[PDB]
Amino acid sequence: FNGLTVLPPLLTDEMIAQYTSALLAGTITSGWTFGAGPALQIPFPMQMA
Amino acid sequence: LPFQQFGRDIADTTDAVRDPQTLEILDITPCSFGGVSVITPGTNTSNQV
Protein backbone atom coordinates (compact mmCIF):
# COMPACT_ATOMS: atom_id res chain seq x y z
CA PHE A 1 0.00 0.00 0.00
CA ASN A 2 2.92 2.43 0.48
CA GLY A 3 4.75 2.22 -2.86
CA LEU A 4 6.59 -1.09 -2.42
CA THR A 5 6.06 -3.63 -5.20
CA VAL A 6 7.20 -7.23 -5.65
CA LEU A 7 7.88 -8.38 -9.19
CA PRO A 8 7.11 -11.94 -10.29
CA PRO A 9 10.05 -14.12 -11.34
CA LEU A 10 10.63 -14.56 -15.06
CA LEU A 11 10.67 -18.37 -14.79
CA THR A 12 7.63 -19.92 -13.14
CA ASP A 13 8.02 -22.90 -10.83
CA GLU A 14 6.67 -25.20 -13.55
CA MET A 15 9.50 -24.21 -15.91
CA ILE A 16 12.09 -24.84 -13.18
CA ALA A 17 10.57 -28.27 -12.56
CA GLN A 18 10.66 -28.99 -16.30
CA TYR A 19 14.34 -28.01 -16.46
CA THR A 20 15.18 -30.29 -13.53
CA SER A 21 13.21 -33.15 -15.08
CA ALA A 22 15.07 -32.70 -18.37
CA LEU A 23 18.43 -32.76 -16.58
CA LEU A 24 17.44 -35.86 -14.59
CA ALA A 25 16.26 -37.74 -17.69
CA GLY A 26 19.44 -36.80 -19.53
CA THR A 27 21.66 -38.02 -16.70
CA ILE A 28 19.65 -41.25 -16.37
CA THR A 29 19.56 -42.22 -20.04
CA SER A 30 22.93 -40.93 -21.30
CA GLY A 31 25.34 -40.70 -18.36
CA TRP A 32 27.76 -37.78 -18.57
CA THR A 33 27.92 -37.75 -22.38
CA PHE A 34 25.09 -35.26 -22.90
CA GLY A 35 26.93 -32.62 -20.86
CA ALA A 36 29.85 -32.41 -23.31
CA GLY A 37 28.13 -32.91 -26.66
CA PRO A 38 25.45 -35.07 -28.27
CA ALA A 39 23.56 -37.43 -26.00
CA LEU A 40 24.60 -41.07 -26.38
CA GLN A 41 22.45 -43.74 -24.76
CA ILE A 42 23.89 -46.49 -22.55
CA PRO A 43 22.34 -49.16 -20.29
CA PHE A 44 22.24 -48.02 -16.68
CA PRO A 45 24.23 -50.96 -15.18
CA MET A 46 27.06 -50.25 -17.63
CA GLN A 47 27.02 -46.57 -16.63
CA MET A 48 27.21 -47.65 -12.99
CA ALA A 49 30.16 -49.88 -13.89
CA LEU B 1 -16.19 -3.31 19.62
CA PRO B 2 -18.48 -0.38 20.49
CA PHE B 3 -15.55 1.54 22.00
CA GLN B 4 -13.16 1.04 19.07
CA GLN B 5 -13.42 3.51 16.17
CA PHE B 6 -10.45 2.55 13.96
CA GLY B 7 -8.64 -0.64 12.99
CA ARG B 8 -4.96 -1.15 12.19
CA ASP B 9 -2.99 -3.71 10.20
CA ILE B 10 -0.01 -5.67 11.48
CA ALA B 11 2.32 -3.13 9.84
CA ASP B 12 0.62 -0.17 11.60
CA THR B 13 -1.74 1.20 8.98
CA THR B 14 -5.46 1.89 9.08
CA ASP B 15 -7.60 -0.72 7.32
CA ALA B 16 -11.08 -0.52 8.92
CA VAL B 17 -13.13 2.46 10.09
CA ARG B 18 -16.49 3.06 11.78
CA ASP B 19 -18.95 5.57 10.31
CA PRO B 20 -20.02 8.25 12.83
CA GLN B 21 -23.49 8.97 11.42
CA THR B 22 -24.49 5.29 11.23
CA LEU B 23 -22.74 2.61 13.28
CA GLU B 24 -21.33 0.74 10.28
CA ILE B 25 -17.89 -0.75 9.62
CA LEU B 26 -16.12 0.00 6.34
CA ASP B 27 -12.94 -1.58 4.98
CA ILE B 28 -10.64 1.09 3.53
CA THR B 29 -8.54 -0.05 0.58
CA PRO B 30 -6.01 2.31 -1.04
CA CYS B 31 -6.65 3.25 -4.65
CA SER B 32 -4.83 1.20 -7.26
CA PHE B 33 -1.29 2.20 -8.19
CA GLY B 34 1.50 0.60 -10.15
CA GLY B 35 4.56 1.00 -12.32
CA VAL B 36 4.30 1.75 -16.03
CA SER B 37 6.77 -0.14 -18.21
CA VAL B 38 7.28 0.47 -21.93
CA ILE B 39 8.03 -2.48 -24.22
CA THR B 40 9.61 -1.32 -27.46
CA PRO B 41 12.03 -2.49 -30.15
CA GLY B 42 14.83 -0.25 -31.35
CA THR B 43 13.74 3.19 -32.52
CA ASN B 44 15.60 2.61 -35.79
CA THR B 45 13.60 -0.59 -36.33
CA SER B 46 10.17 0.91 -35.55
CA ASN B 47 8.34 3.46 -33.40
CA GLN B 48 5.60 1.23 -31.94
CA VAL B 49 5.42 0.67 -28.18
Q: How far does B43 lie from chain A, in Å, by closest CA?
A: 25
Contact pairs from chain A to chain B, CB under 8 Å: 6
Answer yes or no: are the C-beta atoms of B27 and B16 closer than 8 Å. yes
Smallest Cβ distance to A5: which of B13, B30, B35? B35
Considering only CB atoms, which chain B residues are within 8 Å of A2? 13
Q: Rounded to whole angstroms, how far apart are CA atoms B26 and B19?
A: 7
Contact flag B30-A5 (C-beta cutoff 8 Å): no
How were these coordinates obtained? Answer: cryo-EM
Does the CA dihedral B26-B27-B28-B29 come out positive or negative? negative
Of the candidates A47, A3, A6, the one whose C-alpha atom is nearest the C-alpha of residue A28 is A47
Answer yes or no: are the C-beta atoms of B15 and B26 closer than 8 Å. no
Of the candidates B26, B27, B25, the one whose C-alpha atom is nearest the C-alpha of residue B1 is B25
Contact flag A5-B34 (C-beta cutoff 8 Å): yes
